[PDB]
């Protein structure tokens, strides 16, 4: 179980129920706790432990929350910087 | 919109909100930086291998994807053309 | 004879007579016009009309002009987008 903290603001990022996604200060929100799980291509899923929906990022570069464990939306790649 | 690196040191020349002037080897935009905890270290960066968009957590909170990997405050424009 | 400009914070860049080199929002300053210069290669070289110094990083990430045309430090790179 892990949170993505945005260093920079100081803001957490979190998915809501409703699947709209932003970026809060409150790090006492249970709705900031995701679990990054493999893919055997080294990529990964990333989806929130409560809600329990994949996070992925539209075409349009909107991004929200889908429960659909099928779409190549929620394939994330983390590259150390 | 373009960069001036120091192909010397490989520094990117960079303008602050402050004024102020400085170089950096940081070529990406803080703001679609992420920790991941409880690990410490490192700084990785979140992108949708599907449509190659980075994950970016603005001040106001809002959150979205772009391709834009680079800081804007290291993005120059040359006029006048 | 061309601007410097930092489109983000819409500061221009400037190196000041005492070598000191800083952001303005002054459009009718000066020191804050240019020469690009060649380089044979496919590099730079940044140079201010009024005082005349060419522009560097120093390795420390510090950013100040001299007019020692013979230092690697002014050499720059110029990549779009």
């Known amino acids: 179980p892990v949170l993505l903290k945005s260093t920079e603001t100081g803001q957490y990022l979190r998915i809501n129920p409703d699947g709209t996604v932003d970026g809060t200060r409150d790090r006492s929100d249970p709705h900031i706790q995701f679990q990054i799980s493999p893919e055997g291509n080294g990529e990964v899923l990333l989806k929130?432990?409560?809600?329990?929906?994949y996070l992925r990022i539209n075409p349009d570069g909107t991004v929200d929350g889908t429960r659909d464990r099928s779409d190549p939306h929620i394939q994330f790649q983390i590259s150390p910087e």
């Open 48 to 53: 929130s432990t409560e809600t329990g929906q």
